[PDB]
C-alpha cells in the first residue's frame, strides 16, 4: 500500500517518490540529496512547513497521496 509524494526543490523541479506508510523518510531525503549531489543534511525537508526527521514516516505525519514536501537549503549562521 503505497502513496506517491511530490518533492519540490528550490528551483521548482519535482521528483516523485512512491513510499509505504511505514517507510522511514530518511530514505526519501537521502535519495533526493543523492540525485542533487549534496549531503542529505545540507538540506531541510518540510511538510506543511515542519521539518521531516529521519525516522518520521508518512503515517506519523498523516501524509496522503500527492502530498507535497518542500526542500530548502539548510539555514546558516
Amino acid at each position: 500500500e503505497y502513496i506517491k509524494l511530490k518533492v519540490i526543490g528550490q528551483d521548482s523541479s519535482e521528483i516523485h517518490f512512491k513510499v509505504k506508510m511505514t517507510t522511514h523518510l530518511k530514505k526519501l531525503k537521502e535519495s533526493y540529496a543523492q540525485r542533487q549531489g549534496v549531503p542529505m543534511n545540507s538540506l531541510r525537508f518540510l511538510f506543511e512547513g515542519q521539518r521531516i526527521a529521519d525516522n518520521h514516516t508518512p503515517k506519523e505525519l498523516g501524509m496522503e497521496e500527492e502530498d507535497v514536501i518542500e526542500v530548502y537549503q539548510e539555514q546558516t549562521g
Binding site: 506517491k4 519535482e14 516523485h16 512512491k18 513510499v19 509505504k20 530514505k27 535519495s31
Partner: peptide
C-alpha cells in the same frame, strides 16, 4: 523535464 518517480 520528464516525470521522475522513484520507488522506495
Amino acid at each position: 523535464a520528464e516525470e521522475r518517480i522513484i520507488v522506495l
